[PDB]
Amino acid sequence: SGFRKMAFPSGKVEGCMVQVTCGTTTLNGLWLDDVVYCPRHVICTSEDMLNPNYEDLLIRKSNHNFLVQAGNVQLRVIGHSMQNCVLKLKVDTANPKTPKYKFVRIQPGQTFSVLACYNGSPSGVYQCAMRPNFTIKGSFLNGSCGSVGFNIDYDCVSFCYMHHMELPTGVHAGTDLEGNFYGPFVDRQTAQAAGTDTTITVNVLAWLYAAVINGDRWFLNRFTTTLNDFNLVAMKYNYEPLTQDHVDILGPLSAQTGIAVLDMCASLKELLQNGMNGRTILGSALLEDEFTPFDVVRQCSGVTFQ
Amino acid sequence: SGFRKMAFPSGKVEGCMVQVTCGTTTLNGLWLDDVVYCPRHVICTSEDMLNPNYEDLLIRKSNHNFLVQAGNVQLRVIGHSMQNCVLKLKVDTANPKTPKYKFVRIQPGQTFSVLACYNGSPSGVYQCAMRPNFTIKGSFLNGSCGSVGFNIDYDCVSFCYMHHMELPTGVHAGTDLEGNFYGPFVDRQTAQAAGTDTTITVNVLAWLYAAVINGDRWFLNRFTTTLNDFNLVAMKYNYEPLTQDHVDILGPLSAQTGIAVLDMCASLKELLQNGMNGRTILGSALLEDEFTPFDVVRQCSGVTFQ
Ligand SMILES: *[C@H](O)[C@H](C[C@@H]1CCNC1=O)NC(=O)[C@H](CC1CCCCC1)NC(=O)[C@@H](NC(=O)OCC(F)(F)F)[C@@H](C)OC(C)(C)C
Numbered sequence: 001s002g003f004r005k006m007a008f009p010s011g012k013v014e015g016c017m018v019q020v021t022c023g024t025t026t027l028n029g030l031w032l033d034d035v036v037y038c039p040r041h042v043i044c045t046s047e048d049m050l051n052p053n054y055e056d057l058l059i060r061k062s063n064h065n066f067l068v069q070a071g072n073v074q075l076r077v078i079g080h081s082m083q084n085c086v087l088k089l090k091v092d093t094a095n096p097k098t099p100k101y102k103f104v105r106i107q108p109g110q111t112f113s114v115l116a117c118y119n120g121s122p123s124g125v126y127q128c129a130m131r132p133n134f135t136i137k138g139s140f141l142n143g144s145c146g147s148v149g150f151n152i153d154y155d156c157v158s159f160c161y162m163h164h165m166e167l168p169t170g171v172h173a174g175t176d177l178e179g180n181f182y183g184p185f186v187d188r189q190t191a192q193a194a195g196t197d198t199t200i201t202v203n204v205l206a207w208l209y210a211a212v213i214n215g216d217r218w219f220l221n222r223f224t225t226t227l228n229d230f231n232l233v234a235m236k237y238n239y240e241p242l243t244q245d246h247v248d249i250l251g252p253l254s255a256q257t258g259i260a261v262l263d264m265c266a267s268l269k270e271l272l273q274n275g276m277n278g279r280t281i282l283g284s285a286l287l288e289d290e291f292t293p294f295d296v297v298r299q300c301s302g303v304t305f306q
Numbered sequence: 307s308g309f310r311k312m313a314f315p316s317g318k319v320e321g322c323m324v325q326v327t328c329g330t331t332t333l334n335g336l337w338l339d340d341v342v343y344c345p346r347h348v349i350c351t352s353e354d355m356l357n358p359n360y361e362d363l364l365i366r367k368s369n370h371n372f373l374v375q376a377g378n379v380q381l382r383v384i385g386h387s388m389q390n391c392v393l394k395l396k397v398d399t400a401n402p403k404t405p406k407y408k409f410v411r412i413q414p415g416q417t418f419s420v421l422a423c424y425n426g427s428p429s430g431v432y433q434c435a436m437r438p439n440f441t442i443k444g445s446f447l448n449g450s451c452g453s454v455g456f457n458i459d460y461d462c463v464s465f466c467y468m469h470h471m472e473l474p475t476g477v478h479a480g481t482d483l484e485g486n487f488y489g490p491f492v493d494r495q496t497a498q499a500a501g502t503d504t505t506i507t508v509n510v511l512a513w514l515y516a517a518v519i520n521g522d523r524w525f526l527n528r529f530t531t532t533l534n535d536f537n538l539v540a541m542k543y544n545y546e547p548l549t550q551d552h553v554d555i556l557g558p559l560s561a562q563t564g565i566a567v568l569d570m571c572a573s574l575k576e577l578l579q580n581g582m583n584g585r586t587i588l589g590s591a592l593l594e595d596e597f598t599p600f601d602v603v604r605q606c607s608g609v610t611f612q
Pocket residue numbers: 027041044049140141142143144145146164165166167168172185186187188189190191192193307
């Protein structure tokens with residue numbers, strides 16, 4: 001028993017982190033096969049940031065402008081290309097520690113692990129969710145750019161995030177590994193703001209199911225509610241609508257606990273309406289929303305990865 | 307910015323996990339050099355658990371009773387010895403992925419990462435603290451025994467925990483890597499209970515300093531308080547006494563934020579006295595106590611590990 005915000009083992013991603021240096025900019029890159037992926041603003045300088053034209057900026061660079069440090073070993077760039085907001089630096093050495101891997105663009109509400117890195121050297125690992133507004137509430141300092149987010153499925157690393165920037169509110173924005181920003185953000189230092197975030201309702205429900213599997217039962221009730229009637233109470237409290245597809249995903253957690261999904265929704269309703277009144281759920285005093293249904297099943301049942 | 311409950315990168319420990327099987331018991335072991343460490347109750351069976359004599363139980367086993375699975379490779383046990391509550395199975399293969407490593411017995415209040423494992427295969431990584439009552443609020447299912455807790459210091463893995471058992475309250479007990487239980491617990495299925503836990507005050511203070519570094523300032527005040535007067539308010543709310551040694555550890559966090567340690571104690575006092583009144587600190591509605599002063603400095607400043 002117990003329930004922890006749990007990251008995937010990070011050893012497969014640690015083996016891919018490298019330091020990429022160009023001019024006065026140093027950040028992390030991801031080394032898979034003979035290619036290093038990193039944010040394209042690595043080619044910017046201190047006066048390139050206000051409104052850059054990265055095509056113009058990139059035709060001006062040569063391969064020997066890119067210093068790619070892998071441990072105490074310099075990699076040699078032999079070519080470069082830009083796809084959307086990321087550089088691909090082709091290097092002469094294929095990474096022998098290349099895991100099996102995919103690039104995936106995740107939907108909001110989905111979670112992943114972030115291996116935070118500085119100077120190509122992994123510092124820490126934590127769990128995150130894509131917020132409905134396509135930010136992530138990360139922990140990033142300067143030099144953490146090019147750090148990646150990821151899920152692991154059996155033996156395969158699905159890369160889903162690469163870090164570019166902190167917004168003035170202190171949340172973080174970034175791209176998928178093919179370089180497309182999550183959300184409306186560009187990689188240009190301008191006025192930009194997150195957009196009103198909302199709470200991932202389907203995840204809160206999955207976490208309440210986690211609690212029930214782990215002995216917390218005080219918040220349940222006998223009431224039920226229709227899906228329409230739940231979303232009327234949802235939108236007041238700035239929760240996302242629950243779709244019928246959300247209900248079906250929550251099927252196995254309903255089946256294993258014997259609590260119909262619509263009954264857990266009646267629980268959440270009263271929780272939002274009456275507060276928690278000095279009680280806690282899974283050691284938390286707030287309704288947590290960064291566990292997906294995947295996660296709860298993974299952690300409450302025991303799925304590993306080789 | 308941001309502040310996350312952050313584990314160390316786990317790749318160095320992942321490379322040491324193995325599956326140890328003996329009779330009907332399968333758990334994880336730790337493979338460093340030519341030795342596999344695992345909990346000694348691996349030699350118990352389903353009727354060996356009520357009150358065992360592990361010396362008697364162990365003189366009865368031969369090396370070929372221990373199946374040591376490392377990936378899809380059987381290791382051969384060539385000898386075995388018991389130190390306190392852990393077996394050391396000597397094997398013919400030295401682990402080539404052996405990190406640099408130490409065994410340390412940590413004080414309560416200290417934190418570490420747990421790489422949760424099943425069948426020798428890492429499943430997840432999370433952060434933990436040794437609770438003042440020598441339990442850990444872990445996330446462990448059946449088969450997670452022999453999973454280890456650890457800190458990383460530069461390039462060296464300080465192993466500090468190995469998992470043995472869940473208590474009826476659902477918290478977890480275990481040994482250091484030299485096999486000495488944390489706390490009064492034995493490895494014998496008996497009536498056993500945790501003992502009244504308390505809140506790690508020095509850690510709560512370090513976390514409030516984290517908040518201040520990250521822009522949360524609402525809980526501060528102009529008041530100060532003496533150390534004695536703080537501990538009078540502490541012991542009511544089941545907090546641990548703050549020692550002068552706790553104050554000095556919190557020095558750099560005092561110096562970097564400009565908030566004298568005794569002034570942050572006056573803040574905590576009013577927080578315990580007046581609640582948080584619907585506000586949150588670092589996205590939390592409870593006073594968090596599983597960041598040490600180390601951690602806050604590590605995460606708010608950027609220390610990595612090669
Ligand atoms: C990468 O190492 C670095 C990490 C940042 C720094 C602090 N935590 C992080 O996540 N990334 C940057 O510093 C990034 C540079 C890059 C330059 C070309 C355009 C794309 C970004 N800049 C930022 O993260 C700044 N944010 C910002 O003002 O961008 C504009 C927008 F849209 F508002 F986000 C950071 C450094 O913000 C301030 C407020 C200046 C601290």
